[PDB]
Amino acid sequence: PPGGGEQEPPPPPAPQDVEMKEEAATGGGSTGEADGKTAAAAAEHSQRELDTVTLEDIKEHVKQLEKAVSGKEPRFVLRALRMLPSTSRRLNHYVLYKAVQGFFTSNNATRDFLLPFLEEPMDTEADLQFRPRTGKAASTPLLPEVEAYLQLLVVIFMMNSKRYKEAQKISDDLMQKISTQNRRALDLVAAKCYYYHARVYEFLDKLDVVRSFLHARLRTATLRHDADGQATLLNLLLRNYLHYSLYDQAEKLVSKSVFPEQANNNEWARYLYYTGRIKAIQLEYSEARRTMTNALRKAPQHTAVGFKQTVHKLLIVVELLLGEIPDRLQFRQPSLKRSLMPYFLLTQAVRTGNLAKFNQVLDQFGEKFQADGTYTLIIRLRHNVIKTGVRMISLSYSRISLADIAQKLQLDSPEDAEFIVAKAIRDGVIEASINHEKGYVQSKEMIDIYSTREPQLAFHQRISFCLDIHNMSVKAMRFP
Amino acid sequence: DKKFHGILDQGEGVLIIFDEPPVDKTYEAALETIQNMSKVVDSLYNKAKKLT
């Protein structure tokens, strides 16, 4: 008891400092950054806000609970106040409440007091200049609080932050003028709590009412604030719309646009994983392997944790349907390994041309196939076994009888033996010629050609268009 | 031993000599690009340092 009682005081001072000065220096600094320059944006405290939010998402967040200075909620949410020279007095009132909190119990517990608190900024009337400061002062307690998952009486409080964000959405439909430089930070912050829309709604069932609401927000941002807005909202669309049918494959067709410019960073890569599974549902394997590889290869630096391992998991799925895959056991991480353990023997069965080896993988690992969600291609891969199996043996064997190859091709009658190779040439597999009497399959090859034209002529536009973009970057980054 | 360019034919009892010596352009290509791998590996240090 004395140890646990005296170890309570040490923890709070760290949130009492960094959690106090995180939105004070970044938010209060963004106030001066929003008064002028305001180029672009930039508003570098918006990306610094991303660093602080992602910092809280690990440790320590804020709420909890935690029974440490719950008076931080009324601190920033009250006392604009009101015009800038009067706000300076309230800038001293934060220090006044620092002394009040340094004297008495400092209101270490709020809970049901969030009802007057969250409505106090509406009692001030008003900030009135910066809506992102009002939305952030209310959300910063509540957004990390969603990670508690208590599911009692505070879920509707998260919904109240969603209503405050809807007031941020109506103000996202009006001003401007003309030229809002704070709406990019509103795109950032709202995309977060739009994913908190996803989490809080997913506590019970699908959000479908918010699918028409997201389409209302996604379309009302057109065309003005779509920049960096439409990208995050399209992932908010694509993610759960990939979980719930339907039509998103043809919906993103008419939705594009592209939509440029890609922001922010890994956002477009993860979008190419989301739409990567989409474009993989059309089964064209050149665009699917390029969108899946570009999804993972374009994402630094992690941690955390396993969904960046999931894009790598589903990445080589289209490579399994290509007919040739390397053994990936050397790419296993300490985490991704234990997650894909069935998928290991799966791609090992894809390398081999044995049917029973692949079918036993299906019967045993079908439970993990339910966990991943990819099924339909597991039964049709038997056609990849007959095409890779015939690619194997044909190129392999000098002249193979249709009765001897019939074991690995499982039928290979005297009739279909013609089509196996012939319709493989239709798919561009093997050139083997067969004169059918008994018969026997005599595989030869003569090709000397290509390896030339498209690679070098495309490399011209590749390199040139690249260095042109690198011009568009460097030439435009010299403002300082 | 590769000193004698050509090949024989056992079926009809023939021996034929043919050669296409120069690899030089492939040597230049490979020397550039194979090392240019490590080039982008060297740029991995600087351009991934600004991130973290």
Partner: peptide, 30 residues
């Protein structure tokens, strides 16, 4: 073929070195 080789060499040197001196000038001044 040599043309594509010069493309890779010119793009490698110029793009890497320019982005270096670019990102450095921005992060140091800003």
């Amino acid at each position: 073929y040599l043309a594509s080789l010069i493309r890779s060499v010119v793009a490698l040197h110029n793009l890497i070195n320019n982005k270096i001196a670019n990102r450095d000038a921005e992060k140091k001044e800003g």
